[PDB]
């Protein structure tokens, strides 16, 4: 459930991420729709740009925004998010 | 098997990415280091926001400036390289 590994934002820009991801996982059945939903909701919530990666067999060097980075799990799904 | 699923680039950029990804995947066993090396090499060559991602259960739809995306399947691995 609430499992966070590496969070680089403040408490609200982590808790809102957890909540939105939770509602996304409970709504959709599609990983691609999860990614698109996170992007859309965070774009209309915080700032014009929001970039997320969702899956279970991935991992990669990535240039996020300084102070902007989060990585967590939901059941088994690695979900990462950041600003550009 | 070099198979390209989706892309939006020029042919020269796509071929450069194909060859660089081929050499990186053949060299490094772990997807993490493969993506690390690829993204660093395209940081050195092109825009310093190139994102290289790798996996077998990977998906991410993020807001982007166009013309710099590719998502292909080589052998039994999915490799993405894009810029936002």
């Amino acid at each position: 459930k609430a499992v966070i590994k590496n969070a680089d934002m403040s408490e609200e820009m982590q808790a809102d991420a957890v909540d939105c991801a939770t509602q996304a996982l409970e709504k959709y059945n599609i990983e691609k729709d999860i990614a698109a939903y996170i992007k859309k909701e965070f774009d209309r919530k915080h700032n014009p740009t929001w970039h997320c990666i969702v899956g279970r067999n991935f991992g990669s060097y990535v240039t996020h925004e300084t102070k902007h980075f989060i990585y967590f799990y939901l059941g088994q799904v690695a979900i990462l998010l950041f600003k550009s | 098997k070099a198979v390209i699923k989706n892309a939006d680039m020029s042919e020269e950029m796509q071929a450069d990415a194909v060859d660089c990804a081929t050499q990186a995947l053949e060299k490094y066993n772990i997807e993490k280091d493969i993506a690390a090396y690829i993204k660093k090499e395209f940081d050195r060559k092109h825009n310093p926001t190139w994102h290289c991602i790798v996996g077998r259960n990977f998906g991410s739809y993020v807001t982007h400036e166009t013309k710099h995306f590719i998502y292909f399947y080589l052998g039994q691995v999915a490799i993405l390289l894009f810029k936002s």
Binding site: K5, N6, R56, N57, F58, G59, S60, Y61, V62, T63, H64, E65, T66, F69, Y71, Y73, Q76, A78, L80 | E31, K32, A36
Partner: peptide
């Protein structure tokens, strides 16, 4: 602004 992560091989 350059980070590395993958986790929980499955």
């Amino acid at each position: 602004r350059h980070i590395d992560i993958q986790t929980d091989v499955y």
